[PDB]
Design a protein around this ligand. Structure first.
Ligand SMILES: CNCc1cnn(-c2ccccc2)c1
Ligand SMILES: CNCc1cnn(-c2ccccc2)c1
Ligand SMILES: [Zn+2]
Ligand SMILES: [Zn+2]
Ligand SMILES: [Zn+2]
Ligand SMILES: [Zn+2]
Lengths: 69, 69
């Protein structure tokens, strides 16, 4: 039905919100510290000197183990 | 249809995976450091000495800003 389409689109958007904002291919699993933005996979986070959301310098990257992984 | 039910169930489980494992009411937004388990809201994480998943000592809690928030 039309409701099946609405739910498929909601599910798609929630899964896309878990994808790395730089490569668009891998799951987010890394936090930029100290700002706390958690928007990248480990490979893209290792290559950024400043946060792609807030431009704060990245002091270090913290791996996150999320139940959604 | 039956497919609408299947999608409703999938959506529900993905949303439940984002809830604090301790209070079951607030969204996860905190990481235990250095282990990296990200399973609690700020209030429940504040008072734990050891990680509730792996028992490692919590040296500090890092706030996380997730796109799913
Ligand atoms: C926070 N996530 C942003 C993001 C990264 N990638 N995509 C994406 C990828 C393929 C198709 C549609 C969307 C969304
Ligand atoms: C990782 N999240 C675990 C969790 C916490 N709470 N709930 C939950 C709450 C209400 C209804 C169904 C499930 C799941
Ligand atoms: Zn990436
Ligand atoms: Zn940032
Ligand atoms: Zn809680
Ligand atoms: Zn842990």
């Amino acid at each position: 039905s039309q409701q099946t389409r609405v739910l498929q689109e909601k599910l798609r958007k929630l899964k896309e919100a878990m994808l790395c904002m730089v490569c668009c291919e891998e799951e987010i699993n890394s936090t930029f510290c100290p700002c706390g933005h958690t928007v990248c996979c480990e490979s893209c986070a290792a290559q950024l000197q400043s946060c792609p959301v807030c431009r704060s310098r990245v002091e270090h990257v913290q791996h996150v183990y999320l139940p959604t992984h």
